[PDB]
Each structure stands twice: as structure tokens, then as C-alpha cells.
Amino acid sequence: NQILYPEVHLDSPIVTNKIVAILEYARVPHAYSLEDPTLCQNIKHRLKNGFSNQMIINNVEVGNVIKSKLRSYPAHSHIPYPNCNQDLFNIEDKESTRKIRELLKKGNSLYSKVSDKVFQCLRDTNSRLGLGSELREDIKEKVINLGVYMHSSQWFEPFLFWFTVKTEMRSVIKSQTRRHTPVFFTGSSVELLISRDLVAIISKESQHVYYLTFELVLMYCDVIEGRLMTETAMTIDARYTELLGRVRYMWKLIDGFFPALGNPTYQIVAMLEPLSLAYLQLRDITVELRGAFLNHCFTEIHDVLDQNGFSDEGTYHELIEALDYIFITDDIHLTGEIFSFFRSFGHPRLEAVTAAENVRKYMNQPKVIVYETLMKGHAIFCGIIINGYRDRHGGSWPPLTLPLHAADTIRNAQASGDGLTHEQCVDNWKSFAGVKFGCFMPLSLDSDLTMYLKDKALAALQREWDSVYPKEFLRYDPPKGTGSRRLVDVFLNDSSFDPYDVIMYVVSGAYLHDPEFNLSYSLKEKEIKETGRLFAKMTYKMRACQVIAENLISNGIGKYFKDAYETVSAFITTDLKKYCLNWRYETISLFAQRLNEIYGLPSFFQWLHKRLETSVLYVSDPHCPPDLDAHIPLYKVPNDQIFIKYPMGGIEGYCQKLWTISTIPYLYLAAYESGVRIASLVQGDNQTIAVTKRVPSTWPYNLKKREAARVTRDYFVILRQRLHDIGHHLKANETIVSSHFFVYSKGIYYDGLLVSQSLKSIARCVFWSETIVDETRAACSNIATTMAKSIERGYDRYLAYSLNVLKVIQQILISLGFTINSTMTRDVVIPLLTNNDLLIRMALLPAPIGGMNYLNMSRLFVRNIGDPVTSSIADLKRMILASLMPEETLHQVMTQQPGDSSFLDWASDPYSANLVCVQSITRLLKNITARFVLIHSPNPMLKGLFHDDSKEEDEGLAAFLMDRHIIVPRAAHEILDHSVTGARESIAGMLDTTKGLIRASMRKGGLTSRVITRLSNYDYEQFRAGMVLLTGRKRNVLIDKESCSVQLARALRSHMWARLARGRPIYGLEVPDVLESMRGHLIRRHETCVICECGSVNYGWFFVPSGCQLDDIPSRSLRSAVRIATVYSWAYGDDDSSWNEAWLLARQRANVSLEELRVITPTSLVRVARYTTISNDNLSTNFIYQQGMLLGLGVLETLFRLEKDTGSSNTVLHLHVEHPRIPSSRKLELRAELCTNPLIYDNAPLIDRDATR
């Protein structure tokens, strides 16, 4: 293909049977032991028969080379995958790692040239804002000697070895895709063989032999690079001094446990995630909540040590003392940083039999439930639906039929139109015993296409289920597979698709009698748990019915379910992972009947359990074969190995919204019985219940938390009883009850404070990115994004900027010198590597003006910068003033060769400066592939949306909007996003092509050979364009030094766009820079220098008091037409002539007239920020003031970063601040016939009286 590279990072599970299959084809002896020897039989059977292909013959020679080398070492011992980790985390060879060492030493040389001037620029930036007096002395030595601290780490010599092995293995995979035999390379202490599928490492001193696959090499490279970056980040930053020692002891302790314990060490590694929450629970104010969950964690650690044979009292006590040293700290903010080190040890090896027997244990369990609790929850469920329909329809009762025995309260509430409380539902639960709702929720299916375009793997047919296993690993020849593998390939190629046809396929009952139904399991790519997790694959129609069912629940009833005295709350955190296995037909049946009555679909929402009770399920991995002599259908297969014969339960996912809306009524029932109030938050597999009771205001803070904890504990016991009465078995030991903290997506919430994992994004800052082609620009953008995310979670700004510059320099050096790309010619590599200043100026220049630095100095302080070009020019002026870059480079930026782009590319990206070869190439490949497959789709849902002449229409619309006498590029972007062009772009963007659709389009021939050759060489074009930019000598005499960045940005945009603009003005893209406009002064005592010296009175006032402890406490198309009409009437003027064009543009989305269209159209800052008073009265542009307040909060966060409390003085901070009409030149081409597709075009104007939305 020459456009597909082997994968850089690990997105696949680790399977033992792959390693065993390679080592048994290669006939190499190995030390693995399997729980199922089935593969270890089947291979032998094939080797008894004489079966061979090209992969067997290629693997015999590699094994012969390994045996010929192992004759030299007599006492050789193979070590399995977990038991060698402590060795393979610390391995070094000097001779094998010469080239990457020279490249990184050259990177140290360049950073040692520019580090002092980087520090001077950051010091001037700090001194402008007023924080120059509080600059630490150690920051200078950390910035200048950053490369020395990176190279002094203990993971540097492991990382060079594993990066070399990964890069050489990727070369072997792509080149082989002469019959050269791989030979060993004798190093100082390591002998290395690298093949396509196997790597053999022999240690010369210990005579230890390791065999590895590609997945293990990728995992080891990611782990060691993450450890290197994280240890460097903790060594440079002064706030992480004790955490550095604790995580070093953690690394040493777990790496010591790997050789003896092996694969059960990952249970302790997974137990490290509960332990931080338990050690944080130890500091609670309440009485017995301190050591509740720690007891369960310690008991399970003791069980893990006891089952594997370490039944000694000495070992467990030393492990408890070690964990007490690691997890006990005084700072609450540094407690949650251990969550960032969760993935630092690796991933366990997996086998399908263990996960199969776990799901077999859970889904084949008898149960007894109670009718009364089920009916009480059903009554609460009905009450929630009734209250939702009253709230959205003006107090009206929904269509329902109360029975004859209904209570007088319910009947009089139906007659008088009064709502129902929870107490009336629970007490009169027999009034809802025979209710029957009417149909009042529409089925909107022709107006949505966003869901089918998401890619979901499809299982094979039931007649051909052995096709996933190769002939190599089976005793019989499997049937050849004819079913399609992906959902989108079936969906786009479907000749006749009707959304109601699959609902008829459910309701008519054809799914129970379908000959080709099959569900399969597959192992998860990244789970620390040794049993792992599974995701399911099913056939086309059943997956479509699943998607339609979840859409119907989400768009309808589920939206109903979303939400001298003071109030206190206490939190319960529970796990919801194994709830899906616990659901049965009897519990979910009545809720599903009520949803069937509401939606008007007979027996639709009960589909999953009725289908699963009659079908056999299996776990599918290619290397794990079934124990069958011949091909046998699934119903005859025994209930052993990977097969679950007749399950009772729910698959993970697939019905989650229904289970959630069934679960909430039992929480409300336990609330009514316990007499408390509940606020409920559902994360991914984590549920937080906040218990509220009213308390007197005169009470102190100590007793109120005791009262909240008491009522929370009572509620928890009642909730456990009511969840056991329906059969969920909450298992109170695993859940946690706290009076302060709860966990959510951003981090831990502790009493109004946020504890965040700052070091996770630094561990995710690695070389390259997950793209099919290695690109330097995407990697540098990923580095900038990870450093910015770490700054927002609390890392230091200047150190992150220095690490960003160092990693950009090293990334450029790896992209030029150590790469698998064969298109890197010597005409660009030798000029870039010999000229040092050229490469440094390419690394330091911002990317909006043509460089490869994607992090701005304004971005370190505030999230949003306005204009990238103006900010880039201001940063370049700062670098010129700090002598980091020469003056003439600015002239080069203003004399850069313009690129070729049309009005459509300018309307898609309004801030682009017409630069040559900047766009990410994977995005271009995805857009071309998605556009080709959506144009050539015979699906009847896409009759007129995608035409062969769509691109000419889009370019005509863009040239109609932006070829007027004044060019406004931001308004045209808003018009095209809400028009048909942005509708097609949004439909094409939601389809993820991945590797499979790109390969499929390559076999179809949509991607021409010119496209492949052109897209294969853009990295060399980026380096050539950067070299031509930085080596050019052209000057403009209008460039004055220290001029305004706005005028320079206007001149740059006029120069680069001079072919299209032809001298016409451009408006609406220019804003002043955040750092240049604002100057700060700190009034500790005795007045302001700026106010007295300059007389400036335009400033914002910030106040922090002393003596505060910081450390502790209508349709969418109609709205689109309205937005198009509003933007066109505002930006291009309004009169009789302009409203006709606005009506012609807005008519294509909604069916309105001219008169109707006229009528209808009208963070880490919180540590300071709780104490901060901001007054804006002395201010005299809303974006500039908002970013000024964000900058002031960042400055006050930087001032009190290393200090526990404000000391003895109040803190005062001052941040001083320093078209009639546009007629249309073109004419509208439009379309001859208006498209009537229901996704985009609205047939009815609907509510014309309501002008809102």
C-alpha cells in the first residue's frame, strides 16, 4: 500500500496463545503453561499431518537460528512474560543504541544553546505581570539544565533500547509486506534477533532468554517512555518532591513482586486504585467511616497473597507498612496523583476461558425476587413519567387507564389535574397494578442518520461460526466466511433499508427464528484486571434494532428522568459494572410493558432477554480454538471452555438506559423509607448518591456532618435491603460512604476542592501519534495539547513550555534521522542535520506563521486565544526581543511564499494564512474516502443529499459569499456550517473510516495513484517548505521593529491571500494579544507604580484576604434556517434585495416563506478562587476583559502555588489594559430541484407563532 505503516502504540490485548502458537510453529522450547491445552494439541495434529504454508516455513528458520545461538549458552532459561518485567524494565545495551543516543545528544546540544534565552523570555513575561519578585531561584537551573535532568533519569537507558527495537521491528513489518535469515547482533550484554513476529533477547551475563511479540514491544516502549517523562516532570517541578520518592518506592516494590508472583501481581496493581480512596477516607471527621473500606482492601490483598502460596505472616505486614509509606501524605491535592500511575506497570496476559467461566458463573445463577418491592418501584416509575408529562404539557395527565380499584387520591388527582408525590405512589401502589398507558411518544426515525455511521464490529453467521479461527489452529477445515465484518459496510451497501422494517422484524417475531443470529465476545485492549473485560459482536439487523431501541429510549421517556435552617449532604459511591449480568426478564418485564404502551410497539423492548435465553454464546479469539474434532453447530456444543450455552442476563451495554431508568425508582423508594433527600449522578460504571437532610444554621460544622453521615448510613442499609429484594446483591463491602469526597470525570471533589491527576497527560506525551502515516506536525500538536492539559490540571507553566520545546526538537530529530519512511531524501536530511540554527528556528517558530511549535505563551495562561496569527507574531516579537531568534526571520514571515487554496478552504478555516502543506494528511484521506463511499451508496436514505456535483455547488456558494467588495470570512463559515454544505460535511465527519474503509476504497480505486504518491510525500514537503522559508532572503521596508501585531497580521493576511482578495479589505479576524495588552502590579503595601507614573485608570481589581489556609478547608433545520437568515441579515446588511438571497438560502433547510422568515427571525485556579474578590468597577471588548479576569486568576494561582497560606498581609492585584452594506457581486447558481430528504429538509414550518428557537 505504501501509505499504511505498522502501529506505533498498543491498541490490542495481550494473548498468551499467540506467543505459544509462534513458539510451537518455530519449535522453540518455552516455559508457558496453558489452562486449556487445546491449541497445544491442534498444532501437534497439524504437525502430524504435514500441513505447512509460508508462515510455517519462515518460522522454522528463525527457530533454527535461535537454537544455533542457544548452543553457545549452556545454562539458558526462558522466562515468561510477567516474570521478566523487572528485567525488561531495566535493560541496556551500549552498542545497539548508538544512533538514537547521538540524535538525542545533538538535541541536548541545541537545547543547551537556546535554554538560557528561553529562560530570559519567560522571566520577562513573568516580570511584566508583576510576579518578578517571587520567582524561585531553582527555576533557572531547572530550565537551563532540563536535558541533563532528562538524561540523568534511570529510565533513559531502557527507553533507548526499546525505541530502537520498536523502530527496527516496524521496518521489518513494512519491508517484507532473497529470503534473508535474521541474524543475532552481539552487543555488550544483549544479543538481539528481530523478526516480523518474534524478538529474541539473550542476556549474556545471566543467560536469560526472552521471546516477545510486537504487542509486548509496543507496550514496553509506551511504559518506559511514560515513566521517563513522568520522572523528569516530577524532578523538574518542586511541588512533587515527596510524591517522587513515594512513586519510586512503588515502582521498586511492584517490580520486585513481578518475578515471584507473576501474573497475579496485576490484581495488586488494580487494587492500587481503591487504596487512594480508602487512605483519603481515613481522614474523615466522622467516627467509624475512617477504616471501613481499607479493611476490605487489606483483606483482599491478604487473600491474593494467600492463594498463590505466600502464606507467611512476615510478608503481609511488610506489604502493609510499604503501602502505608506510599499512600499517607499531608496534602489533599497530592493524594489523587497516584491515579496517574495506574497504567505505569503494564497490562496482563489474557485467555478466553477465564472470562468465559466468569460470565458463565454470573449468568447461570438462580434467583428469587419479591413482588411487592418490584411493584413499588413500578409505581414510582409511573409517577416520574406522569410528572414529566405534566411538566412539559402544562399540567395535563397523559393518556392512561386507571383500574376500578384505584384510590380516591389518584382518581381525584386525574380529575383535578394535580401532580403526584412519591409518598402517594408508594402508599397506593395497588392503584398502579393494572394501569395501561396510551401512545404519546413519536417514532422519529427518518430524521436521524448520526448513529448508523458509527462503526461497530459484526459477528459472523450461525451457520459459519468457525470461520474466525484459522485452518492453522484447527483440526478440521473451517467453512469460508461470507458475512461482512463492519456495520457501516452493510448499511451503505444496503439496497432497500427501511427503519420500520427492523421494528417489524422484532414485532413480527422473526428474530427468535432467525437462522443466522450470532453473538460473540472479544477481549478488551487495556484492562488491568486479570480476568479482563469483554465486548460483544452481533449481526446486522439485531445491532440496528439495538441502536434504534436506545435512540427511542434516549429521545423520549429518558429525558423525563433527568433532573434558620441549612442543608448538608453526604456521598455514597457504588459500582454498576456487574448490574447488567443481574437483570432478568421478570424484573425488567413490567417496565418494558409500560414503555411498550407509551411508544406503541408490541413486545419490542423485551427483545434482548428473549433472544439470549434461546441462543448459545461464545468468546472468540483467533488463537484460542474450540475443542472439536469436526464442524458442529452451536446448540450441540457442550457448556465448557469458551461457550455459555443458555444465558440469563444482559450483555454489557446494549440496554443501559432502560436499566438506568429502572434502577432510579428503587433509590427513591429507599429515600422515602429512610426519610432523606437524594441527588443522583451517574458516571461511567460509578454512581454517586448525595443524601441531604435539613440542619439548623446555629450548629457547628462538626455535628452537621455527623448527622448527614448517620442518615446516609441508615439510607444505605435500607437501599441494600431493597436492592437485594429485586436481586441485584449490592455487596456492601465494595461500596464506599464518605462525608467529604466523591469521584467524577475531572477528578475527586473534596468539600469544594478539586483533586486532579496532573501527571497523566505528561505520561501521555510521547513520540508520534495514532495516525496511519507518521507526521511530525500531528505529533507536535499532541505534545502541545498534553502540556496545555497538564498546565490546566496544575503543572507549572514555564517548565511545561521548556519541556515542550525540548520534545519538539527531539521529535524533529527523530522525524529526520530515525524513521521508517523511505521518502526522506538526502536533499532535505543532510541540509537540516548539518545546519543547527535552521532546525532550532524551525522548532521555535509558531505553526500559524509557518513553524512547528504549537504552544503559545498566551495559551499557558488562558484557554482561548483569539487570533492565532496575531498571537504568533507577538510571540515572535518576544523571541526577537529576548534574542532567541533573529530579526530577519520576521521579514521572512512577511515574505513567505503563498499557498494555493480556494474560497471553500478559507470558509472552512477562517483564520488560515494560506500556508504551504500544513493540513493533516489522515484527515484528507478520511474526507476523500468518506465522500466517495457516501456518494456511491445505494442507500434510499441518501437519495439527494450526496450528488456527484456537490463540490462545485459548495465552491460556488463559498465564492458567492466571499467575493464581495469586503471579505468577511467568519460570517461565511457560520452560513456554510448551517447550510447543506455543512450538513454534508457533518454527515461525512461522523463516519469514521479507520484503516478498513481506506483499504476498501483502495481496492475500489477511488483513491487514484496520483493521490497515493502525493499523500505519501507530504512530510518531505513540510520540511522542504520550512527550509525554503527559513533560508530565504527577502525584506519588506514597511516592517518596523516593535510595531503593532495587528497591523503586521493584517499585512500578512493581505500578502498571503492577494490572489483571491486582490486588494479588498478583510474584516473581523483581528484581536489584540492577551499578554501584550495587559500589565500587572501587586500592591503588598504603599500604592501602585503604574497608576502614579502613567495615569492609567483602566484596570481590574483583585483582592485576596490574609490568614486563609489554601491547602485545607422546534426542528433543527428550522433553527438552522433562522441562524442563516440572522447571519446574512446582520453581516451583509438588510434591505429588500438582501432578504431575497437570505430567503433562498434558508428555504433549502426549512419550508418557510419570506414573511414567515421575517417574523420568526429576531481547574487548579480554585485554590485561590474561593477566596478571591474581583471588582470590575474601575474598568472603562468583552472578550479582552474576560480573558483578563482569567489571566488574573492564573497570576494569583502562580503567586500562591508553593505556599500553604496567605501570610500576614492582604493581596491586591491590578491588571491594567493598554459596513453600510455589502452587495453581492456574483449570482446564485442554487439547485434546480429542492432536496426533500427528511434528515435535512423540514417539510412543515410547524410552530410559526413561537419565534424562540
Binding site: 393494572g434 401512545c439 413519536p442
Partner: protein
């Protein structure tokens, strides 16, 4: 004697006029009875469709819903 017999006839007729209160009392007991049966039918209705395969051949008790959710493919 005949007039005295008429007083006896009226005296026996008074208790028959009082029978209307007893007859109205039977009406209230039957009204309370049909609610009590309706509770049992409501409990039988919920149990039958929660437990699958128990309907005693009613042609799919879940399918008793109304069908006009702008579907109508038939």
C-alpha cells in the same frame, strides 16, 4: 274490630318499609366486593405478563398495546 285490624296491618307494614335500608346495605357490600375482586385481577394482570409463558394462550399479553406510532408498514 276491623279498624283495630287496620292498625295491626299498618304496624306489620312499617317493618317492611324499613327493609329498604337493609337492601341498600347489600348494595354497598356488592360495591365493596367488586373492588376487592378488581384488586385480585390487577394482581393477576401484573404477575401474568412479568413471568413469561404464563398467559394461558392469550396471544402474547405484552402485545395488548395500541399501534399507531406513525409506523403502519402493513
Amino acid at each position: 274490630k276491623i279498624h283495630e285490624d287496620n292498625q295491626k296491618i299498618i304496624s306489620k307494614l312499617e317493618s317492611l318499609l324499613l327493609l329498604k335500608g337493609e337492601v341498600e346495605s347489600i348494595k354497598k357490600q356488592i360495591n365493596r366486593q367488586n373492588i376487592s375482586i378488581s384488586t385480585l385481577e390487577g394482581h393477576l394482570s401484573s404477575i401474568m405478563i412479568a413471568i413469561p409463558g404464563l398467559g394461558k394462550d392469550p396471544n402474547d399479553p405484552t402485545a395488548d398495546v395500541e399501534i399507531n406510532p406513525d409506523l403502519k408498514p402493513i
